[PDB]
Amino acid sequence: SRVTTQKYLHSPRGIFELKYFFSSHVNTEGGGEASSTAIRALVKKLIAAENPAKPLSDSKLTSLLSEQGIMVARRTVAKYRESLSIPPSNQRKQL
Amino acid sequence: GVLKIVKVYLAVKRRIQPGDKMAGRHGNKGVISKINPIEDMPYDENGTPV
DNA sequence: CAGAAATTGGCACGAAAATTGCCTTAAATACAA
DNA sequence: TTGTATTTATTGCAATTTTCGTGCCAATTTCTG
Known part of the structure; x- marks a missing residue:
């Protein structure tokens, strides 16, 4: 806990906090676990490719994720989206 | 700390x-000092300018 | 028109995870009696 | 011979706080009859 405080690591991808690698988890199909920092990337990817006329809601993201066996509740998806600073589904539609 | 470098080459003709x-x-x-027109340059018997 | 279905987020759970303040000496060693 | 002042070695425990995912439900949007 003490060592990893405010020390940076330089990977070819970029510069990280060395505490960015410690993350939470949710259950998965098959008895495994999936990290929250990967579910955030998956949610960002899914939102960044939806139909602009009909944006995906939190239920339509929970159901979409629960076909690769990710087993995430809707409220957790909402928490991840609000952590990513993405407006709700009714505020992303456009003509 | 460098990700990508892009180099662009431009070619121009100088007269x-x-x-x-x-x-x-x-x-x-x-x-x-000057770019003189053809009909002002000195010419010889055959009309070829200089 | 309007009741109903759908969406969203504040607040609340137990459990897990992460922090933070301390036992503010015990045992090997060389020296002296 | 032994008792002792001297010198290393010691980078962990155990409370206490904070954060986790997810359910309840009221307020706001959207939708179909």
């Missing part, structure tokens, strides 16, 4: 004009 410096092989340099 001759007054102020450009010309010379020769015997140490006789000079600067162009």
Whole structure:
């Protein structure tokens, strides 16, 4: 806990906090676990490719994720989206 | 800390004009002062200008 | 028109995870009696 | 011979706080009859 405080690591991808690698988890199909920092990337990817006329809601993201066996509740998806600073589904539609 | 480098090359053709410096092989340099039209240059019996 | 279905987020759970303040000496060693 | 002042070795425990995912439900949007 003490060592990893405010020390940076330089990977070819970029510069990280060395505490960015410690993350939470949710259950998965098959008895495994999936990290929250990967579910955030998956949610960002899914939102960044939806139909602009009909944006995906939190239920339509929970159901979409629960076909690769990710087993995430809707409220957790909402928490991840609000952590990513993405407006709700009714505020992303456009003509 | 460097991710990508992009280099762009531009090619331009420079013509001759007054102020450009010309010379020769015997140490006789000079600067162009005028671009004279053809019908003003001196010509010989056959009409070939200089 | 309007009741109903759908969406969203504040607040609340237990459990897990992460922090933070301390036992503010015990045992090997060389020296002296 | 032994008792002792001297010198290393010691980078962990155990409370206490904070954060986790997810359910309840009221307020706001959207939708179909």
